[PDB]
Design a protein around this ligand. Structure first.
Ligand SMILES: C[C@]12CCC(=O)C[C@@H]1CC[C@@H]1[C@@H]2CC[C@]2(C)[C@@H](O)CC[C@@H]12
Ligand SMILES: O=Cc1ccccc1O
Length: 250
């Protein structure tokens, strides 16, 4: 008995985070998005402290730590939101936060229905593939190291090593159960397919939040500090092609 890696992931797993949305007032595009933007600002802080508590993370260069966080904050938050939706309301609604649950009506009011549907579909994959709590944690941590600039990072060497170790950890979680190599191999295939399906979803939201920031003043949408900063400086690099995700399959 020495599941050191798994113990840490479960120990640093962020807690509940509210958005502070007023569910007593009628829904409106402006109010809904502004609340999500706030929820994002609040989440980002938790993610920063979460990633810094991850094994080996500290090895990365000070600038690369911030970089990976600023590039995958979108993918990480969605993957976690999809899980909450499955374990809380069985993927029937998007459980963004306790005080911010989106239904068929809100998905429409948000003016991003198509994107919400895709996130719900992702949430459903958790049930169709019978994803275990331990498998979820590993995959989420792996997402952090799933998007870097095509020109590599400051110390790209250390990054590949850390990623390799997290992938190795995913196999242990799979192997430490199955007996035959047919089940393990098959399982790895399924999980990798699940992780890649996240990238497409993330890119669609990256474009939506970017365009929204440009018209924010026009639609009366409030963008927090870091949120506006990261979206107008980091996000563009991804949409331009300077920063691309790391797919397992082609
Ligand atoms: C990451 C958040 C907030 C955290 C969460 O649970 C997932 C969710 C996915 C949609 C994002 C939202 C933050 C604010 C965004 C980026 C809006 O501007 C448009 C898409 C929204
Ligand atoms: O382009 C390279 C790069 C991008 C983000 C962080 C560190 C880097 O070296």
């Amino acid at each position: 008995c020495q599941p050191i890696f798994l113990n840490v992931l479960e120990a640093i797993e962020p807690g509940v985070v509210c958005a502070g949305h007023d569910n007593n007032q009628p829904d409106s595009f402006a109010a809904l998005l502004s609340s999500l933007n706030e929820l994002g600002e609040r989440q980002l802080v938790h993610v920063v402290k979460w990633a810094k508590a991850l094994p080996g993370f500290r090895n990365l260069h000070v600038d690369d730590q911030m970089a990976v966080i600023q590039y995958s904050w979108m993918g990480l938050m969605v993957f976690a939101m999809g899980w909450r939706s499955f374990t809380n309301v069985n993927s029937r609604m998007l459980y963004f936060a306790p005080d911010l649950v989106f239904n068929e009506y809100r998905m429409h009011k948000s003016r991003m229905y198509s994107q919400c549907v895709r996130m719900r579909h992702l949430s459903q994959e958790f049930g169709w593939l019978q994803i275990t709590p331990q498998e979820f944690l590993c995959m989420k941590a792996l997402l952090l190291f799933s998007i870097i600039p095509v020109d590599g990072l400051k110390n790209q060497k250390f990054f590949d090593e850390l990623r390799m170790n997290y992938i190795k950890e995913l196999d242990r979680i799979i192997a430490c159960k199955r007996k035959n190599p047919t089940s393990c191999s098959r399982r790895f295939y399924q999980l990798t397919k699940l992780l890649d399906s996240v990238q497409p979803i993330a890119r669609e939201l990256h474009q939506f939040t970017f365009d929204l920031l440009i018209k924010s003043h026009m639609v009366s949408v409030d963008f927090p500090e870091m949120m506006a900063e990261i979206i107008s400086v980091q996000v563009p690099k991804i949409l331009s092609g300077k920063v691309k995700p790391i797919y397992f399959h082609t």
